[PDB]
Amino acid sequence: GLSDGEWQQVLNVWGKVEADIAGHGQEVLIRLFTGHPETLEKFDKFKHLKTEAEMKASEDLKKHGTVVLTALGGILKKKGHHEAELKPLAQSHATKHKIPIKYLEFISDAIIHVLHSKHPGDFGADAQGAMTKALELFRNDIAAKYKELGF
Ligand SMILES: O=N[O-]
């Protein structure tokens, strides 16, 4: 889906995330939950987080942030050749977690937002184009498996 140039940008940007995977993960999930509270309802382990202060204080939210972004980082490093890596996540998110694809669009928007917020002026126009394309590629492939499943 992406040029070599663009994957190079993606993985350069991802270097920022890897310097603090838990901090980026936490902010991504906070941005997701605060912006779209219905998403929090999908996590019976975060459902108790009534306030953003409680979210910020939750070490388990940070932990999940690390899981989510580690899984994404793994995927991104495959530069689109990610069928094996994406399959179980499509299946778990459609069949077990019941996550509509729209919420994957929300978390993609949250990643772009967090990158800007944590790295203002350091996440260039090209970098945003490339990262956006990578996230859409990820979403588009998840969506194909959701359609296979009828979800
Ligand atoms: O936070 N997505 O598992």
From Swiss-Prot:
Keywords annotated in UniProt: Cytoplasm, Heme, Iron, Metal-binding, Muscle protein, Oxidoreductase, Oxygen transport, Phosphoprotein, Transport
Origin species: Equus caballus (Horse)
Protein name: Myoglobin
GO cellular component term of the entry, any: sarcoplasm
UniProt-listed Enzyme Commission number(s): 1.7.-.-, 1.11.1.-
SUPFAM superfamilies (UniProt xref): Globin-like (SSF46458)
Catalyzed reaction equations: Fe(III)-heme b-[protein] + nitric oxide + H2O = Fe(II)-heme b-[protein] + nitrite + 2 H(+); H2O2 + AH2 = A + 2 H2O
Intrachain S-S bonds: none
Binding residue positions for heme b: 93
Protein family: Belongs to the globin family.
Gene3D superfamilies (alphabetical): 6.10.140.2100, 6.10.140.2110
Record-linked PANTHER family: MYOGLOBIN (PTHR47132:SF1)
